[PDB]
Paper text:
The epidermal growth factor receptor (EGFR) is a receptor tyrosine kinase that couples the binding of extracellular ligands, such as EGF and transforming growth factor-α (TGF-α), to the initiation of intracellular signaling pathways. The extracellular module of EGFR consists of four domains, denoted Domains I, II, III, and IV. Domains I, II, and III form a compact unit that we refer to as the ligand-binding ‘head’, and Domain IV forms a rigid and elongated ‘leg’ that connects the ligand-binding head to the single transmembrane helix.
To better understand the origin of this apparent structural heterogeneity, we used 3D classification to further partition the entire dataset of 765,883 particles into 10 subclasses. The clashes are relieved by one of the two Domain IV legs undergoing a hinge rotation around the connection between the head and the leg, and we refer to this leg as ‘flexible’. Dimerization of the transmembrane helices through the N-terminal dimerization motif is associated with increased kinase activity, so our structural analysis of the connection between the extracellular module and the transmembrane helices suggests that the tips-separated conformation of the extracellular module is associated with a more active conformation of the kinase domains, through its coupling to the N-terminal dimer of the transmembrane helices.
Author numbering:
A (entry chain B), C (entry chain A): 1 to 614
B (entry chain D), D (entry chain C): 5 to 51
Write the structure that this text describes.
């Protein structure tokens, strides 16, 4: 078996993209060589003599199927087998065919959906396509479940009369395309009461497993054509096999060698790195409200916070924000103190002009500083609009991670296109987990190629696309190439502030030429190209190095006294000990700290009683 | 064509039209911009 | 009345509990009026004229069924429907009928288990009972599972042949006894060709749900006879309905309205209280190593752990302890620092004597101090032998709770019987969650009737059987009543230390009437009737209050320098802050330590700037 | 009766037997004690 070539599926709903010639090219681009439409299938405005010899591979539509306003005569949806009907058109249907006539009543004529058997959800609509015969013969009781047989609306009228009668080798007047190959195959309304699901025959011995949607090949659940609920890499389960089983004898769970993490609508051995692994085995996009992310174990689990935890706000495109296009003026209030965004960011030029359709007034430019709190984002970042007054992306100077969970067009996490921006300004960016980045079309931007995003892409297959920006030769020759002394392999701004890759070293948020070893005011050491100050108690070494770590334990020589392994400023004189007994010490010859006589309560300046008078 | 109740409905210089049969309104997005109302830029093919 | 009565079932395979009349009484007390044996059904040494008519009620056996060494005429197991076979006799049998005869060959003759229809596990064995007839005609491939037909062992050599014919009104000359009702009713080898499990007739439209265990009445999951898996309040599920259902479309889990906790072979909506509610929604006895009791709002869940995870060792029997049956001097070491027993304790007389049949040497009575650290028992504590030298349960003074997951004889959690100890010595026992308390048969033990055991009982319905200890009117006339200062609740021993609660004051563990607030050296302060000594810096006034709060912020006068409410023994000598004002203190007129000045660079070893020379 | 390989088999003053038919050994627990080796005490029915 091989993974079926998926396509994202359009969502335009009767909107024409460009010219009649070009609208068809868009269709030719999205649905070419596609076998599983992950979204919706919309075939609109296809004009006469335009072929559709690429629609003969779609085997499954996960949303709805809209066929309207066409004029071509043969829309060959050949191998379509099931319309899962997740979404609906007009909130009712999962297959609409509407008003396919041209000017002189010569619209769609041959719609040979012979392999279609099942519609898991929704009704069907056929309307005002006056040149459509040969589908009135189909029986819509086998197709649609018994639940929706009331919502269904059908209308067929071929007033012309050039309707060919079809081959009599199949069900009473039931043919999709005129012939013997293209007539209906009933698999629900022909079988005895002893079957529940589909049934490939009238004999009680050829019944299909209830976890099969269109039809089966044998009697098992591994013999379906398309799986109804899940897919355990060989068969159509109903729920992914649990990770741990509970035996009712010893009253405790037990590992399961068949358990699979339930990701998406499949069962997998393990989940991708950027997803929230639950204990059930589920792999979610955003853990519960009370909970909050974990960091490691190789995965990204979610623990339960300790009360008031980092406020996260559902970004655009989820739940409360599905009616909203971008961050309007209205909906900007709820982004006050969100630390992370479980979602993705749409920055659309409608959020700066203010449309009267959604009754939304224009947004104000300085409001964008509310986004100075966020630190990472789960889905994608989509930047298309920005006030020309500002020279860089200021509201995003805290972001360090881009998870890219629900990416854009299924491809893009970062998308910075066609802006009057002169600097990206990403002094905080540390990784882009998944997706792709398109830094293209910006008027200036300049510093964009000298970043080496390859060091920011955690997963594989990710690619960048950096074109149509002010070339370096036209910007580097105008005093804009970034600063030196900071390992020039990376700069999100002209000053050395950012400089991804910090020279050979760095002093926190800034790059430097070398750590303060040997000399300098604060003594330092080097690990991972970072300069950390020594403990104040290490002696300034004018010869060799000073320390080999942060703690006073790694000093080469203490500045004052030495209490064992540690370098102390003054020997302890009141520190809590065992049995509630205080602790007093003294400095001897080599400034070493030794304990007082147990008796000496007021401390001691020497060993034993010969050290403390009182 | 669309009455001014739907003015400015089609973003990015849309050409809002009226489908006679269905009794519905819809956009005529410029090339390179997609979506129900010409909102998004077709990133997958150009800049 | 669906709570059908249950037994515990014996587990003494071929032993004889006394005489033939005592063994038959022990057999009657067990299985009289119960329908679901939870253990095993063993019927041994039952002589003639003993009427076993009390067995006609049993309907299910969760373990094996042994029927041996009888000489009775008929064993009326004529309502038994299934033998789950969770435990095998001789490692492979869930029904074994061996040697029911005496030395004249007139033994068992009628075993009319006409209703036995399923044996979910294990083979069957018959042997050497040369008066059993009308049972070789049973075809045992309909009853025994399809797998275990290779371990079976049956031979019916009734050479005497002194019984009736088999009615031809049942197929294949098969019958259990005489008459027409006592013959085989088949449900597995007469099914249709398509049936999944067992059936109800022969036609293809009768097969039962594949969860029905001993045949069904209708073709549903809610009309079985026995549920071969979990039962959910009317039905027979395969697994209990999970609490949360992962949504493959939005990639997020959401609660299930019919989700239920799996507690044993039942789906209950709420766990019993003394049962660890786990993450997967299933009541457990004791979760994995990396966990601990996180009691939270009543439910005893268990989190990851508190970092370094405390020691929890396995109890007797559970785990790697089934071989041995008490704490012998071979498994005492494994209890080194275990602070919580996962299981239960068994201290038995053979532990001190030293068993030769298992080769373990005697336990030295000084190795019981290893048990000094235990703080909680999840199952039960059974004590039957303590070194007569010792005078109380010293090894369990730190015992703090007995949960009661497992119980002895399915009823008892605390079992102190047949000892020579004088007082209990369980000074820190606070709660017996579930079980009953059997403290009986001790020659010389007082103080056991004073305690209010209703105060230690986590649930209702528990009761104590405290009887036949040292007489009530014999501890008065010896001085064996506890301290007059301990509250009327009770007392474990004679000391003022080992009481339930003090009357006026407590000091650590001891109970005292008037503690040291106004006199004595530990000048304390009363707080929750436990007066404790406060901050050690403020000596006792003439007779007045010495101190009122824990810290120095409450003492009236402090025996040393008084820095207002912030009393310390010395004057501060260089407290740290911003800009490092090395402010020291000194002894001014009113003994208050006043702030130093940076003018005297030598600190402040004298007063102010007029008394600060070298 | 039973050989010295099974001596001290039955605890609490046991009377270890030899089952002739099944060719196995067993106990003859004194009254009040239960178990395969007469180890436990029948708590439900006495002290």
């Amino acid at each position: 078996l091989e993974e079926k070539k998926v396509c994202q599926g359009t969502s335009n709903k009767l909107t024409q993209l460009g010219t009649f010639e070009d609208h068809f090219l868009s269709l030719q681009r999205m649905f070419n060589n596609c076998e599983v439409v992950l979204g919706n299938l919309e075939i609109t405005y296809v004009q006469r003599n335009y072929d559709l010899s690429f629609l003969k591979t779609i085997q499954e539509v996960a949303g709805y199927v809209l066929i309207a306003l066409n004029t071509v005569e043969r829309i060959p949806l050949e191998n379509l087998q099931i319309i899962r009907g997740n979404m609906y058109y007009e909130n009712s249907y999962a297959l609409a065919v509407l008003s396919n006539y041209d000017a002189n009543k010569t619209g769609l004529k041959e719609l040979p959906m012979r392999n279609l058997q099942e519609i898991l959800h929704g009704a069907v609509r056929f309307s005002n396509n006056p040149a459509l015969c040969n589908v009135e013969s189909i029986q819509w009781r086998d197709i649609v479940s018994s639940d929706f047989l009331s919502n269904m609306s059908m209308d067929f009228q071929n007033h012309l009369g050039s309707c060919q009668k079809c081959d009599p080798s199949c069900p009473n007047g039931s043919c999709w395309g005129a012939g013997e190959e293209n007539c209906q195959k009933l698999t629900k309304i022909i079988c005895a009461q002893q079957c529940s699901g589909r049934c490939r025959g009238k004999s009680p011995s050829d019944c299909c497993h209830n976890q099969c949607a269109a039809g089966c090949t044998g009697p098992r659940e591994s013999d379906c054509l398309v799986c109804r609920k899940f897919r355990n890499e060989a068969t159509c389960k109903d729920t992914c096999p649990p990770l741990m089983l509970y035996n009712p004898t010893t009253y405790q769970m037990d590992v399961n060698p068949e358990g699979k993490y339930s990701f998406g609508a499949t069962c997998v051995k393990k989940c991708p790195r950027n997803y929230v692994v639950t204990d059930h085995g589920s792999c979610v996009r955003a853990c519960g409200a009370d909970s909050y992310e974990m960091e490691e174990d190789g995965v990204r689990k979610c623990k339960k916070c300790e009360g008031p935890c980092r406020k996260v706000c559902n970004g655009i495109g989820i739940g409360e924000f599905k009616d909203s296009l971008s961050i309007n003026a209205t909906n900007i209030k709820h982004f006050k103190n969100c630390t992370s965004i479980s979602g993705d960011l749409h920055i659309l030029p409608v959020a700066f002009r203010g449309d009267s359709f959604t009754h939304t007034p224009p947004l104000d430019p300085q409001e964008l500083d509310i986004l100075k709190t966020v630190k990472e984002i789960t889905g994608f970042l989509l930047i298309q609009a920005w006030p020309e007054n500002r020279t860089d992306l200021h509201a995003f100077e805290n972001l360090e991670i881009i998870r890219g969970r629900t990416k854009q067009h299924g491809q893009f996490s970062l998308a910075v296109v066609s802006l009057n921006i002169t600097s990206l300004g990403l002094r905080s960016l540390k990784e882009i987990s998944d997706g792709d980045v398109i830094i293209s079309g910006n008027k200036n931007l300049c510093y964009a190629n000298t970043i080496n995003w390859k060091k920011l892409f955690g997963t594989s297959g990710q690619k960048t696309k950096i074109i149509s920006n002010r070339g370096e030769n036209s910007c580097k020759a105008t005093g804009q190439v970034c600063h030196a002394l900071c390992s020039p392999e990376g700069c999100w701004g002209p000053e050395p502030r950012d400089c991804v890759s910090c020279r050979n070293v760095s002093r926190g948020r800034e790059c430097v030429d070398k750590c303060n070893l040997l000399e300098g005011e604060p003594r330092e050491f080097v690990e991972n190209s970072e300069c950390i100050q020594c403990h104040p108690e290490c002696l300034p070494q004018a010869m060799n190095i000073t320390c080999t770590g942060r703690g006073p334990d790694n000093c080469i020589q203490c500045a004052h006294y030495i209490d064992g392994p540690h370098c102390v400023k003054t020997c302890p004189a009141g520190v809590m000990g065992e049995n509630n007994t205080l602790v007093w010490k003294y400095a001897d010859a080599g400034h070493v700290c030794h304990l007082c006589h147990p008796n000496c309560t007021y401390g001691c300046t020497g060993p034993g009683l010969e050290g403390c008078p009182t | 064509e669309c009455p001014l109740s739907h003015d400015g409905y089609c973003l990015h210089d849309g050409v809002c039209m009226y489908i006679e049969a269905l009794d519905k309104y819809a956009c005529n997005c410029v090339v390179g911009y997609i979506g129900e109302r010409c909102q998004y830029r077709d990133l997958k093919w150009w800049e």
